[model samples]
Target: QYEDGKQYTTLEKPVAGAPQVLEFFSFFCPHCYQFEEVLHISDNVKKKLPEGVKMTKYHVNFMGGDLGKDLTQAWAVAMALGVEDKVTVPLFEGVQKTQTIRSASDIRDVFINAGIKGEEYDAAWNSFVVKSLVAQQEKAAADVQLRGVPAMFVNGKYQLNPQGMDTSNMDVFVQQYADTVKYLSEK
Candidate 1:
């Protein structure tokens, strides 16, 4: 089990921002679906975040087969179009609850049903920028030697170890995560 900095390895190269938090997740992962509940940063934690500390969410394409790749591209498109907040929860629900987002078209339909126009969705989904971002995120995941979804990194230097904490209680885990981030930010 990890104990903060002791077990958390530093990134060979730190992420751009000081004390940045990155969440590497996949929509198809059940654990990630569960982690969503705790992913919301509390107002207190937000206030504690040091200036310039940023948070980013990356969709990893390590699982779910072809569907995984499709979802990753869809996520990139959503991010590119600034519609992630609108589509993320629904996409997660479609996949985890209904099992309906099985292909690229299905993903597009989810975005369309969520209010993004067909042309806008298609353009972003097929844009060179989105493709590049997808490739970059995939490479970043590989660079980190990511073994699974629902993983988080602070400052790209320390990976939160699920085995190191009480996974059964998400409140405890969230608090620990926030505390870790706050502690690391001070360093």
Candidate 2:
């Protein structure tokens, strides 16, 4: 509770329905790749979210330069199609794991291979829902003054302090992480 800068920081924001856990990350980041794929801390934590609370990821448009905002836009499409995990894993594999994604087309190719139709992909790319989602990612990142990738906030206000977390025990790590997210989420 006394851990403001040391443990967490509360940023005033609006939250509706169930509280949400928002993770700001980029495909171009190896640490974020490890965070989701290797460590799976976010996944384990997701399971423990208080009822109705949901975890979501926001891709930083500033990270994958040259690719511009395409990664974030692509994720918006994947989320809309209810294929977020299906598309996210492979994109993460290519972007940070295999280093296979280099250009905008390479991203489109990944989506196509992930079973998203080319026409549908184009439509979603220009879809207003996607544009707004992309805007939200960039705006929220700017609002938080993001300094690093894989940053997570509970209910868009309680920023999780990764440094305050224990990493020695994997199980201990996850439960505590869940508790932190859950605690702030309920508040």
Candidate 3:
């Protein structure tokens, strides 16, 4: 069911032990915003992840200029606090719609607005868990000779091309995409 190098490409470095999904994307990417805010593509794929497997999103520090790294830090902190679901939309809105979030510190305001106290945010912002994750994400983002955002790599081995999937019928597109993810995860 998996079409090698067409539906997905086998990467040089495959995740050794566990089956994992790596999503390389940026908040500054409108296409990725569409996938998360409009299509909920990540969420759909998440549900299809086999038990005990996890999907990790790598906020590529290749976009938004100097703010790219900061945004990665923000995403890391959000995950640290288990507040990613709360901050995701606001981060996207800040990037594409409202332009309210311009810098990394601006992320604190969004987090606080989402009910996270400033102290809580600051703690996680500098916390080792978040910092290490930000480091790892940068390493992961750089490891791939990536050309685009909203990219998916299963087990860091297979890359899926969602662009090739027609979206005229949204349901069909979501189905086939998730199915492909499922297909790769179990492989």
- Highest TM-score among the candidates is held by which one? 3
- Score each candidate by Cα lDDT: 0.75, 0.78, 0.83
Q: Answer with 1 or 3, whichever has the higher lDDT.
A: 3
- What TM-score would every model get versus the actual structure? 0.85, 0.86, 0.90
Which regions of candidate 3 are displaced past 4 Å? 12-19
Best by lDDT: 3
lDDT, candidate 1, 1-187, per-residue tens: 3354453546666655322676788889888887774355333345567888777778988799999999889989988989988987888899999998888898988999989999998888789999998997787787677888777777667776555555577677667666766776565
RMSD of each: 3.1, 2.7, 1.9
Model 3 residue 65 lDDT score: 89
Report the alpha-carbon TM-score of model 2 versus the true structure. Answer: 0.86
In the range 104-180, model 2's lDDT, one tens digit per residue, is 78998998998889999989889999998888778777776778887888765678777777788767766776777
The CA root-mean-square deviation of candidate 1, after full C-alpha superposition on the true structure, stands at: 3.1
Task: List runs of model 2 lying over 4 Å from the truth.
Answer: 5-7, 12-19
**lDDT winner, 2 or 3:** 3
Clashes of each: 0, 0, 0
**Per-residue lDDT for 174 in model 3?**
79
